[PDB]
Amino acid sequence: AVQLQESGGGLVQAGGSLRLSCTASGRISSSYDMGWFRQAPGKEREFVAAISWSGGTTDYADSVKGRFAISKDNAKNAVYLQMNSLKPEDTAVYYCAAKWRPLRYSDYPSNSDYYDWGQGTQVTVSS
Amino acid sequence: WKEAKTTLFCASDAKAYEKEVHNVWATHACVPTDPNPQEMVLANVTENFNMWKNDMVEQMHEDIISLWDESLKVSFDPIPLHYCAPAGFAILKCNNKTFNGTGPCRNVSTVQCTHGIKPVVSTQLLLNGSLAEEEIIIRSENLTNNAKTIIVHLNESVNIVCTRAHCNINESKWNNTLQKVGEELAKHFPSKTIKFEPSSGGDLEITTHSFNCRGEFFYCNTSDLFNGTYRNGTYNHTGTITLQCKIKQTCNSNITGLLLLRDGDTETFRPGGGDMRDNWRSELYKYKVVEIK
Ligand SMILES: *[C@@H]1O[C@H](CO)[C@@H](O)[C@H](O)[C@H]1NC(C)=O
Ligand SMILES: *[C@@H]1O[C@H](CO)[C@@H](O)[C@H](O)[C@H]1NC(C)=O
Ligand SMILES: *[C@@H]1O[C@H](CO)[C@@H](O)[C@H](O)[C@H]1NC(C)=O
Ligand SMILES: *[C@@H]1O[C@H](CO)[C@@H](O)[C@H](O)[C@H]1NC(C)=O
Ligand SMILES: *[C@@H]1O[C@H](CO)[C@@H](O)[C@H](O)[C@H]1NC(C)=O
Ligand SMILES: *[C@@H]1O[C@H](CO)[C@@H](O)[C@H](O)[C@H]1NC(C)=O
Ligand SMILES: *[C@@H]1O[C@H](CO)[C@@H](O)[C@H](O)[C@H]1NC(C)=O
Ligand SMILES: *[C@@H]1O[C@H](CO)[C@@H](O)[C@H](O)[C@H]1NC(C)=O
């Protein structure tokens, strides 16, 4: 459906910052949530951050609260993740995702199983 | 007769005068349907199918997304939609009514359009769909993988009506349903006890039974339905069963399928949903797209 492409990954020194971007092809309708996920070496994928497309409400994993900020630009059909104060445990492939939620009851974004997925961007944090 | 992919188009019974939202989106983008039924039965012919990798599912998805998006910029009653093959291609229709959506199917047919499918966004249970003929069906990409969803086709309909909220289910019909399901699961899962329990957690749409009626969203408590042990024999332990619905601001419908998730001595299954593509997979398990050779 929505086709996603991540950008911005690379190598960063411990304590540094990096901004990742994700843009779709295809219009994102009002009921989508957009999120970021990551998969560290040999570990299972985990939630990082999500944002409501229309309302702008955010949710952050406990491990990243404060250190990362998710934002959006609706006109560009883009979502962003500003990562500050990066740590070695953040080394992972970061994935952008979409979840169509036409029956949502509130504007609060989900932290559960997203259904449309990007190809990933690699982030490596050096000790 | 070569498997391929191509853009499809939709056929509607839409009327230009109606202001109902499914009509106005269909009038603009769905061509009028063809009275001639068309048919091309074949037999003793085998083709591999995989319902979990069908581009036809994705195409209905993007249409309903655009349908809802442009509709909610009041009326809301869906229309059965037909999806049709272009020139140079055809739609193959597997006919083994015991087919589970994967592997070889030895009985096929050739159609240029699909049967009428109205788009009903829902979770946990599938409504107003197509009943399974003869036996009850069990579908999954990997039963070994707990995360992959499990779609259960209903071969006996159960009427469900919820008004302005509560919902109505006849216990006799529901207890028939679960006993068979656990029995099919007993075939699919050995020696193991097989329980039904409500959604452990997640968003409100997944944890409740969510659906739209005339434009108003209803979220219904499912702890009452998924509450049984069904091992050797059967036993349901809950309080006609009634469920609690939250209006956000009547519908006469019938259930046609189930959506289950397993946790990994006992194997427990819970209501699920979320990816409305699996709702569409319920009505598109038969069809495949091939290129005329
Ligand atoms: C193949 O399907 C046709 C159409 O339903 C049916 O009449 C026929 O008996 C089937 N052949 C089998 C099951 O061998
Ligand atoms: C539905 O399927 C079950 C499979 O166990 C079967 O026992 C039952 O007779 C079927 N009901 C029908 C065909 O009406
Ligand atoms: C479906 O049937 C095939 C045999 O044609 C079998 O290999 C596969 O495991 C079955 N899958 C399910 C989910 O029943
Ligand atoms: C199902 O089980 C695991 C996934 O948990 C996978 O490695 C395996 O290959 C799958 N097998 C089949 C037959 O789908
Ligand atoms: C359903 O109702 C029961 C009993 O009131 C309650 O324990 C449960 O949390 C409810 N679940 C939802 C999703 O409302
Ligand atoms: C049925 O009971 C027998 C003992 O009589 C037990 O060994 C078996 O595991 C049980 N089967 C199921 C499906 O509960
Ligand atoms: C089964 O139903 C009873 C009454 O409806 C309830 O008290 C119990 O918690 C339910 N079991 C669950 C939710 O696991
Ligand atoms: C099911 O169909 C009936 C009429 O056939 C309609 O009134 C009802 O709204 C439909 N239910 C859903 C959930 O679309």
Side-chain angles (χ1 to χ4, degrees), chain B residues 186 189-194 230-233:
Chain B
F189 300 89
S191 310
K192 296 290 186 176
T193 316
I194 299 176
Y230 303 84
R231 16 77 180 88
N232 280 329

Side-chain angles (χ1 to χ4, degrees), chain A residues 1-2 27-33 99-106 108-113 115-117, chain B residues 58 61-62 64-65 68-69 121-122 203-206 210-212 217 219 247-248 273-277:
Chain A
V2 285
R27 184 177 190 92
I28 297 170
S29 59
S30 68
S31 299
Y32 276 81
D33 286 339
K99 183 178 175 171
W100 188 44
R101 304 180 61 206
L103 301 177
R104 64 156 67 260
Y105 175 85
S106 70
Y108 204 89
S110 188
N111 67 305
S112 68
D113 41 79
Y115 310 115
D116 308 302
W117 295 90
Chain B
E58 282 280 1
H61 206 55
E62 306 180 19
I64 310 310
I65 296 166
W68 282 50
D69 186 27
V121 178
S122 64
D203 316 336
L204 183 62
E205 329 114 331
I206 294 183
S210 297
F211 56 101
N212 184 291
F217 301 77
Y219 315 79
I247 185 261
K248 173 189 173 184
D275 202 2
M276 295 310 126
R277 301 203 270 267

Side-chain angles (χ1 to χ4, degrees), chain B residues 132-136 155-156 179-181 183-184 187:
Chain B
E133 298 182 356
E134 304 178 21
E135 253 226 17
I136 260 180
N155 69 344
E156 295 189 2
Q179 188 265 336
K180 317 170 182 183
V181 173
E183 192 181 7
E184 317 288 70
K187 301 183 307 184

